[PDB]
From a paper:
The ETC is composed of four large membrane protein complexes: (1) a H+-pumping NADH-coenzyme Q (CoQ; ubiquinone) oxidoreductase (complex [C]I), (2) a succinate-CoQ oxidoreductase (CII), (3) an obligatorily dimeric H+-pumping CoQH2 (reduced CoQ; ubiquinol)-cytochrome c (cyt c) oxidoreductase (CIII2; cytochrome bc1 complex), and (4) a H+-pumping cyt c oxidase (CIV) responsible for O2 reduction. CI is an ∼1 MDa membrane protein complex with 45 protein subunits arranged into two “arms”: a peripheral arm that extends into the mitochondrial matrix and a membrane arm that is embedded in the IMM (Hirst, 2013, Sazanov, 2015). In mammalian heart mitochondria, the majority of CI is found in association with CIII2 and CIV (SC I+III2+IV; respirasome) or in association with CIII2 alone (SC I+III2). Here, we report the isolation of functional SC I+III2 from ovine heart mitochondria.
Although we were able to separate three distinct CI open states using the standard 3D classification, we reasoned that because of the systematic worsening map quality along the peripheral arm of CI, averaging of particles with diverse angles between the membrane and peripheral arms was still occurring. Hence, we developed a strategy for the separation of different CI states on the basis of the angle between the peripheral and membrane arms. The focus-revert-classify strategy resulted in the separation of nine distinct structural classes of CI ranging in resolution from 4.1 to 7.5 Å. Of these, seven correspond to distinct open states in which the Q-site loops are disordered, one to a closed state in which the loops around the Q site are well ordered and the final class to a closed-like state at 7.0 Å, precluding the assignment of any of the active site loops. All six CI open state structures at ≤6.5 Å each had distinct angles between the peripheral and membrane arms. Whereas in the closed state, ND6 TMH3 was a clear α-helix (residues Leu52–Met74), in each of the open states, the helix was interrupted by a π-bulge midway across the membrane (residues Tyr60–Met65). Given that our preparation was largely in the active state, but many SC particles were in open states, it is likely that CI undergoes conversion between open and closed states while active as part of its catalytic cycle.
Residue numbers in the entry:
A (entry chain A3): 10 to 83
B (entry chain D6): 1 to 80, 85 to 175
C (entry chain A8): 1 to 114
D (entry chain D1): 1 to 201, 217 to 318
E (entry chain A1): 1 to 70
F (entry chain S5): 1 to 99
G (entry chain 4L): 1 to 98
H (entry chain D3): 1 to 26, 50 to 113
The structure:
Amino acid sequence: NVWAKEPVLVASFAIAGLAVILPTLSPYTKYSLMINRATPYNYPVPLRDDGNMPDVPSHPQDPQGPSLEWLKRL
Amino acid sequence: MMTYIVFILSIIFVMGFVGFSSKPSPIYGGLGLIVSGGVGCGIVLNFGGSFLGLMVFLIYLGGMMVVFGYTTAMATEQYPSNKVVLGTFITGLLMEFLMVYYVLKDKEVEIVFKFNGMGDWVIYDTGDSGFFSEEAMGIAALYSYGTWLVIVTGWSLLIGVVVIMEITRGN
Amino acid sequence: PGIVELPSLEDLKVQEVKVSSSVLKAAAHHYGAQCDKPNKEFMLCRWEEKDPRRCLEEGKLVNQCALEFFRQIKRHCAEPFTEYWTCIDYSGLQLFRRCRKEQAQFDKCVLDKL
Amino acid sequence: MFMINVLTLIIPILLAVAFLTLVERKVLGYMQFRKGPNVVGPYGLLQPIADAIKLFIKEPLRPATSSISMFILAPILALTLALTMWIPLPMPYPLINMNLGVLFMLAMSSLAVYSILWSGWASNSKYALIGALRAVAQTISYEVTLAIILLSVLLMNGSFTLSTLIITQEQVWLIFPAWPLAMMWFISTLAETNRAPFDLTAGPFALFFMAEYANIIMMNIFTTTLFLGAFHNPYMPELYTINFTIKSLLLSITFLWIRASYPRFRYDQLMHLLWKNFLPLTLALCMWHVSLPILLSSIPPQT
Amino acid sequence: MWFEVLPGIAVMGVCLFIPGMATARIHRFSNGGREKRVAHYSYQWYLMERDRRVSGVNRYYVSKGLENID
Amino acid sequence: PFFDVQKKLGVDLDHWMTIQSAEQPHRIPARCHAFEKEWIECAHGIGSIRAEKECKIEFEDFRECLLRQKTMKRLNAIKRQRDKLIKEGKYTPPPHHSG
Amino acid sequence: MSLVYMNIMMAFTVSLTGLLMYRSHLMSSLLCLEGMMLSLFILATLMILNSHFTLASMMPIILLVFAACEAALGLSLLVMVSNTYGTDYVQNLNLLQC
Amino acid sequence: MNLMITLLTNFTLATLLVTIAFWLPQPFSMKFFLVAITFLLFDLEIALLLPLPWASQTTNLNTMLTMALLLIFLLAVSLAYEWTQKGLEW
Amino acid sequence: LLQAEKDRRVLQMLRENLEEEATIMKDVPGWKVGESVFHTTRWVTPMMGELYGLRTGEEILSSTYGFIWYT
Amino acid sequence: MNPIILIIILMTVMLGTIIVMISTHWLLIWIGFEMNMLAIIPIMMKKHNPRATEASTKYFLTQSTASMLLMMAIIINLMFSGQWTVMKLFNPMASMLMTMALAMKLGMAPFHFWVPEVTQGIPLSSGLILLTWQKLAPMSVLYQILPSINLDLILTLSILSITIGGWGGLNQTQLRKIMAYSSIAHMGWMTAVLLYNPTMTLLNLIIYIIMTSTMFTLFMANSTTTTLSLSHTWNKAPIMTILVLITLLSMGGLPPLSGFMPKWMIIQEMTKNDSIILPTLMAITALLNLYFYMRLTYSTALTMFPSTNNMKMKWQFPTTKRMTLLPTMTVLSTMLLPLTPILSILE
């Protein structure tokens, strides 16, 4: 109906509507936020030892803290 | 090719501002403002200097004096030096060299300030690990935290569009 | 107002680890793994008390840990570490994906012998 | 060694432009049924050398201008832009590694708009002013669109550094994640260099001509760099230099070949065309290239 | 045919070949077989400055490999 | 009239732009961070007149942090006295790498 | 004190006097207003670069874009003045007298 | 000042070219003005838009997506407004 | 490691500069010898005219403005 | 003009003034003043005469150099103790430039030359909205930035504003120039008490905005630009005459009438400070700025000028002009004498 008169307008509105709506439905924006968060620009500053913390491991080989393992599995 | 090069570019900057504050023909004024903006770009790139002077170079020296010369072309003609313009240029150069001499061979010349007279390598960082050329991530933060600011900025520019078409005979 | 209290040159003379910087980058991961354990004490000293001229003794201690680490990596395997850092060296800014197979060779060396 | 680099970059541009004149005349000649220039020497190379030196010999029309210093000041600006504007474009290792160079590209194109305006003012009477004013308008009509498309095509690349571009175009060419954006970009490069199908209908015509054809070679070099390029092996970069020069040659031939066979546009048709056809579509491609990398979970590793 | 436009194309391509080969040759020649180090960020600049300081010759490309551990 | 819609609706639309020592995007400090923290905590809940005439010590300390006025004055006096005694010619100086 | 600030403020005051006194055309006056604009741009930008005041670096680009659209409104008014007269002179405005 | 050295060499060699090229041989329309301020205001909004690829790396992405789409959508509103109100026609 | 090297280097420049001050200004009246201008006795980072001052050209031009117009 | 476009531009004027009010950042104050300018320019040139063209040109140049001098003062404020807080300043020079920029922006006797010229060649709706909002918006800023001002600035500007807004007005017979001179005099009154107790200044702002709304509403009810037209509107309607009487004398400020309360309370909290010769000089000039009101009254309602016919014709047709809100603002503008303790409604 309008596809014959101004076709570049209709194509622009279609791709604009998907560029607005399409970021809602996603299994990937959570991955976007995780990858964008997990990049250390600054130095990871240590902390004073004992406020009686049964967490936060001392050797960086110890997997007690939250590591990243979804990276190497894409 | 020496240490006081930001100072020298500041002096050529004041030279340009005097050179079109002498009120020439407006195409000579636009030429002088392009020269002044180029050396101001040189100054701000010499203070390091990543993005902002290359940003003003597109806007004023990329899309504002173009429109000024465009409007000088369409509106005025200036169809064919004078003692007034040349006298103001000589008095401006006199003020320039007077301030430069009385600062360089002294401590300070003050309007109301305390200007320590030496080269401006001071002050600067002591070679710290900046790693992102601070202004870059600064203006990168203009979108995350800048909620209200870009909203009122875009709304002001949209209203500027409707203002220009109405004044230039809306619709 | 008041005078500054700056320390002496005889305390401010420790031999640096005068390696170049590209090899220092090329050996950085195992420098952070085995050593750099007592320098988080140094860095916590620095961030709590923001006074260099107060936490410099731990600077001496990280200097000697780095020097001992470089002694240990020099006298044992690898000599292919030399080929590895000159492989990572001249490739502009250092991407680790530039020289990967000799990184694997040096890793197999240090894994097997040490 | 630095001024030696300067001489090896800015001396061969004159040879490049004059041999581009013979290349485009021979290409138009074989698009037609023409040979020539081939009578003057072997295949016509000293014939562009000869007409360049003739036009330097041939006596100028005496001015008959106004503001002789401004008549000096415009073509010197055009040719010094054409000289200064091959610096960060990487033939394999570029002249100055910059944090940002593509905004510098667009700003120098805006300075070329200034030079066209100043030549049109300082040239002659009213009709030359009106024609050059419309030419400045149809040159300034596209630094919206080309800069917008540049922003969209390197939003997939994070940084302005252009060496991250020459890295991250290794797997597939960037012509494939944006073909219509690149095609509209190439139309805007025809608009920046101002050839047919974009109309035109004085002195020095040699320097005007020089600035235009160096602008053409510059925009096609930046076309080849911006969109494609094969793998760069260090300690043998002559491979990348050869492949770069070959694809820039092919795209320059295609550029002149698109000039060769189409009529010029009506001026109001040109403005109507640009605004009401390219500009909503460039915005739509911008917003879709904004919304895509948050959906592919791949923002570029902006160092 | 187009067999004779290819001399003009070849000569103009050689005139486009010289700045790439010359630039890469001078970059590999100005640091003794090394590459000219880039510095976009101040971290790499401080690393390059301590690199040119430790080598003793006040030129960064030499870079004092492993012969001064102890 | 300075209204308080800013505090009543609660959304801090502007308080991040306002001072230094806010949440920078990469957590880097300014040049005079600690001086600002001490001056702001000195003049926080104070009636802006005895805040003017009691925190003046740290205020002038912060001003000469931010501009480094007397510090450059002392450095210029050092270089002028160095210049007049090198014009005198006593002890051609080994402050430049030498002894 | 960073002595460059003295000459930049002096150049500001020179641009301000050039904005105020003008005899022939309004275009040169608006252009010196643009120069005064650029002066404030440059001074604030040099300060924000020197002090490492890194978060609120919105100022140079936002002052730029806003006072540029101010100049756009000024160009529209000057085109209207040149429309309603033969020229755009400072004179021929002797209607609407105080 | 090394790119200033390149700038000086380009400018001086170009002046050598010009001086050898010279000393060896010896009303208006309203519709022009709409395009000027149209370019000016849209180029200012481009000046707003162009630091977007600096900004993609942050931990608050939803607001940046929303306001970036708001800025381009406003630019589209301005273009469609002058399109519907016969702004650039002949 | 770089932080420790930088700390030792800047304390070295501070000790050198204060010894050179205490030699060179022994004739002017007044002049307390090494008092920091600030009131609060805290370690402050100096203004890069106290680290790289009185060096005459080479190291200061490669230090403050070296990276700014290096490439 | 389109009504959608006009309602949107009114919304932008509202938005700019609220951004001037609420924002603790200096940049947003400057943006609010600028957006106020950019929106208020097409409120003028609502017609297409060159009168509005020259008026908006003069207004734009003075308005723009005021905005840029304000930005100069703010960048000097950050040259000194550097933060974007609306507070006490840190410079007599920056405060000096800021008060001069807000005096250019506001309307004040060394910088008042644009006001009668810009009000001569504009429609009355545009004049009403520019007077109300452009005398409203900088007063919030001055109310904020009071504690760091040299009083010589404000007081010389105030005294000179009251005496020049008085001495202009005796010779001008245009209604708009009379209202503009009255505006300069009342802004001098509202500037004078700023460093003493600004509750008086904002209450006087409320009163003067109500008075200006009543005045330009009573001149919207009949397309009149000269006093001869006011005599013809005496002939065609009698209630307009007695309202011109009461409202013009309320501009005059007599004690049974509501315009005396802003003068009297100012003299109260001005003379609890021990300056006395300055109150009596200001109030003698308040006696001075009443004569042009009085001859305006004598033209309209208390003498009877000869009238042209076709008012014979006009008597058939009703007074079918719409009034925005006339009677509420009228009796609020005149009968607000015995509500003296509504001073405390403000702070």
